[model samples]
Target chain A: MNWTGLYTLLSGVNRHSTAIGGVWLSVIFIFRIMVLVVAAESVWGDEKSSFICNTLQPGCNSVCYDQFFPISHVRLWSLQLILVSTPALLVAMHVAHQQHIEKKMLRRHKVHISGTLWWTYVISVVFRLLFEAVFMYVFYLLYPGYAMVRLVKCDVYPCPNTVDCFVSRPTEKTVFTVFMLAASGICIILNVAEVVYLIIRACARR
Target chain B: MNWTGLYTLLSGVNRHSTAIGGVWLSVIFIFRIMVLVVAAESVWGDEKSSFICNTLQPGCNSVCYDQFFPISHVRLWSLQLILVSTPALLVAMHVAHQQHIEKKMLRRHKVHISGTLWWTYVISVVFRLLFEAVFMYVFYLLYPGYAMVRLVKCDVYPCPNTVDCFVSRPTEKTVFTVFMLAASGICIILNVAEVVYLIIRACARR
Candidate 1:
């Protein structure tokens, strides 16, 4: 990949970066909270229906929860991402420090901070999609019968009743996983292609 | 690094294969199966209240079967090992082909297929632990102040009651999103790490 091409990619992304930022900001603002709200609205938490702690143990009594909620995946998936973020951030910071700008890619022009971030998001998103695909696929293979409805066992711990709050089940997991994987993959590939196009366009202009 | 040591490492893994076969087999026969059994036990058929499949639609009249329960992740986790088993089997197959004999190092066989598998297992288990830990942290962040008492919301669609069914409360989601990002990072890292380890080990050995 031409280093300049990468920079061009960043610049283009920067233009739409607002869109990306908006999406994530919206996600952080709405979906993050929306998930639980929607979940709470849709579910009927009960005593028998409970959550498993870090120990994967039921809160109060009886096997309180089962993987019957979709929010759990959103929640669990988030954890998986966090793990990736830690290292990525570390590496990004390290590069930013060394380059006195970012990534040590080109010391002269020096990569823009936003450009570096755009690149990181693009690359990591591809990685994330691929990993989740195989992962969710494997899980699907193992439990052919599971669906989106059961993201986790339903219980709020010490919850008085045994109502079970349901979640997205296997009903759409395959579709969702595939769509997500494809969407992210395409978004990345196209973005790269666009960068190449931009460079080609840039060179032609020159 | 000693060339001989390097050679030993290669020959060691190449020659003494079938190491992980037994572990995987054991996993299939024991751990995986047991986990599955427990998972299935929670299925609606076995424990009506325990799983979502059994929880009928909320009070719109008659209760129907849980149209969707034990969502995607539940099913996915069950088959996760089996999907994992494929890669393991491939490596071990090569070892069996080699007849379980490794080139002994004059430097003392410091490593072998067994050691390789041991490292793999150790790392995988460690990540699993980390995954769970980060998951809890994220979960709490998302559902803050929900109280351990109402940790989960469980009920058939349109749960008749809310008290025992779920905990509805305040959620800002910034902290939750960050935690989610952090956790996702872990998943990506683990995925790449394991894949890289296996591929390198397979190629480097023999």
Candidate 2:
């Protein structure tokens, strides 16, 4: 009854697959770069000029400035290595896929994963964010004297040091824990939002 | 047929939807209270806020007190609104499906449109972010000396105002532009990844 509309339908999918495929290619690329640069910078030197400083410090690797930061203030090294290295694995998969797909549209979806993947993204991000939040709370409990930690915690005219006493009052610790958890909660919320929107949008399409 | 060895596979869509649905309820509660409080406070008193500074001064609302700044930042506001609203909508849709099992999982997915809604997300955020970036660039260009304009334009630290100023240098602009586009680009990538993974996961289950 409507053959022309059918042609339009297939065209839309064709265009969509191409665009999504291209975007994934780049995301995979950038994730790779962000990971590599962050790792190399932490170990070798973050900025190009920092190479000379790294050489002079001998063993000043993987964030040579670690000593400058108090031990209690240290953070997880963002797993830069893992992010940077993942693209190659993805690339290999794509390459193998290339050998198998002869049709245009199907080949384009090689990188495409569905709504279920949100569970993977959600569980991972939420758990990681929650874990980091708890760790931050523990940091305050152990290092009340650290000015830097407290500065981030308190907000006087000129924000004050939060960690002024190891056994910081229950109120402050509770506040800090809630604050940190809330921050992470934002990330997870955003990630979840994106996934849900995509899912509905996918589902609602013609 | 051993009861222990033989299993019945059940669909978990409604269950999974309910859990996310709960999160959506909480998000709505928090977001609504915060928005209502912020709006009501702004309309009423001498509230020392972080974003509005009681008179739309250089700060946020009393609710946040700039504690979770830059809440006053429009880009951030847009981002938060989207995340908050999208999930609320999704949860509603889920609830509707629970009530209408006959229309479950896209009543006519055989004629489904793919990637259409996905691209909309990718495009909308990028356009909004870019527009704000350019809008700031304009203020920086026109009212070169105003602190408030520069404050918003330069972001946290501050930068000089001029078309070719250090802050507006072509190279740095190009780099930042590329970074954001890269970020926008990745959303589509993840969509592809998640979608592809879902297909594989579903087929495997089959």
Candidate 3:
């Protein structure tokens, strides 16, 4: 699903966020979400057709391809974005709930939501940071050094014995993988900074 | 290093902890550390000698063994235990630091260290829980379903071509691995419960 509308809405909500939080939002949108949607899809688009094995055995290429790339980079990134953005919804929902309570009480007084909401937001950031780290680790485990090796040795099931497999656009895929990892690292740093900022603000307020 | 003394000391400190925290301590000590140190080593001790390969090639078995078992389960668990327990030390150190400050003030009043320390403790638990999860994921990736298959196909470097390798005591190892995973799961549950307990207590106090 297109997230343009959601991005616009979240950007509006981010206006009420702290400086670090705003930067975090930008990083997620520009570096992560936008990059994944716009560039990553095209990078991995030709993967299925271009993947070739030297063996003439039927179903060998498909089996080896499945073994080599258990999960596609684009789909994995999509899943990562979905999970990473989910925690922020907690903050948004909490804000809406607080607004509803204030309206029901018929009090014009600004309900101080900063205490619990700040903690909630901080926790959300923490969870987001964790998701980024985890997805990065999974990517690392799946593709060592983010390298899509041009040549792979395949001896698994339905391969008709050991055979050499070739992948298309190894360098291009590696570049995008490394770029995504860097983006994830930047997002993690921003989340950490935001968490520290929130904690310090809480301490100063006390 | 022997941790009996440290366990004793930590148990003493647990006297001041909440019920959830005390339970968390018990889970860590009894299920994780105690099991790892007392039982896990012997279980994995015969791994090297008992590992058998059908081929008599000079270095094939060693190379294949390295390929099949990149990291020993015992070593991985030890690393997990070390990293998992490290976060709790933050709470212990924080307590000591607060006690030092209190003594310097020479006031008989029991200084309330719960506010910041409670948050610190909760954060520590969160980190510990996260460590357990990441390591568990790593283990799951390393050993799918914690299964030690009796037969492994090796086609990697220095193996003199593809060969069949046999692992000794596959059932025993699988049982231990599954047990460790279960223990980790239990610790994670305890940690989450403790976090909830801390949050509820914090809200109630405010």
Candidate 4:
């Protein structure tokens, strides 16, 4: 009798498939990396042009020539590498699926095992783990530092010699950081399972 | 060839069947709820013990009345309800599985549908969504308040006339909050997917 309401309620999943999960996770990770990089860039944008002597160093009350932080380059490298690795992770996941499928077919068909995916899988997993560890360290370390700098710059008695400040979006930054951290964790889980599974697959063959 | 590492690696998967995910999600939700409730109680514990006039309230600050926050009861009901629903979720998942299997077998054998899981699934999904929405609100609202209260209580001046504070575990609380938030998010994702899938299944049958 009430087909329209029932139909409308259940219409959301009409085209759903299990493969959607892998794609969804990849997209979330990619989106997180994008937000993180944009946030990073917004903070770091002025760093290149706004070089100042180390006035804001731990104990320095005035502009000291030696204590100046390059302010702009703080953890920039790690952030870039993290940015690069986001898409790389997506590619690696796709290739990982391919390799798994190929390995299955080759095994069923009694074909020789391909060493190509083996190396790719190993490298990707190891690289991911490395990146994740460093990314977390860089994010944790510099995030607070950046927040402090922004806060100090915004204060009524602003840091006299600090570099120029841009607007900080605290809420968006916090949301991005949370998602990035969680997404990185999920990627690590995926990579770990892949590495272990691949190793075990090789072992099983031998 | 050493089999130890290989055996160890593959052994990890030996006990891991598909059902483990259901059990794992259930366990994580249960554990997060436990930590959340404990943390809630710990702060609320101090509130119960310590009585104070409402200096922080809109007005009067003396040994006066009508100003104390009923902090002991804030959001405690929602947390307990969330805790209770963890077990309900587990049971719902189990019954959902049974219904799916029975429906499949019934189809194969040309028998009538039992309708056993239809209501169970609907009730669980509705209850879970309702609880999740309320829990998120309660958590978002009170978590910051509790955090600020704990921070204020731990400071040197303490809360001028507020509750007798206990030793604050800021680090532990932060970790618990992070995990609880992440775990709750994951459960919501799973529940959403399950609801969508169940809806589609019902729709397709009709």
- Reference-based lDDT, each prediction: 0.37, 0.32, 0.65, 0.43
Taking the candidates in order, what DockQ does each have?
A: 0.02, 0.02, 0.02, 0.01
| Per-residue lDDT of candidate 3, residues B1-206 (tens digit) | 22233433343242135544543454354446645653343445546655656565577777778877899998999999888767766667777778788788786135355556665666777888899889988988887776667557888666676766556555545655766787788777877887787777768989
- The sequence of per-residue lDDT tens digits that candidate 1 reaches over residues B21-103 is 22222222232333344234322123333322212344421232232222322343444435443444444455454344544
Give the higher-lDDT candidate: 1 or 4. 4
Number of clashes recorded per candidate: 75, 29, 0, 1
Off by over 4 Å in 4: A1-206, B1-24, B33-78, B81-113, B143-167
Better of 2 and 3 by lDDT: 3
lDDT of 3 by residue, A112-206 (tens): 44555555666767888888899888877876776677889999755667888788887877777777788888877877887787778768889
Count clashing pairs, candidate 3: 0
DockQ of candidate 4 against the true complex: 0.01
- Report the C-alpha lDDT of model 2 over A1-206, residue by residue, as the tens digit: 13232222211222122223222322332323333332232222222222112122234322322322334221222332233224334434443444445354445343454232334433443444354455545555655533323112221222122211111122222333343334334533443454455466667874
Q: How many backbone clashes does candidate 1 have?
A: 75
Worst 10 residues of 2 chain A by lDDT: A163-172
Ranked by DockQ from best down, the candidates are 2, 1, 3, 4
lDDT of 1 by residue, A38-119 (tens): 4323432231233333332223333233223323333333333333233233333223333332332353233465455555
Model 1 spans > 4 angstroms off: A1-33, A36-75, A80-122, A135-139, A142-206, B1-206
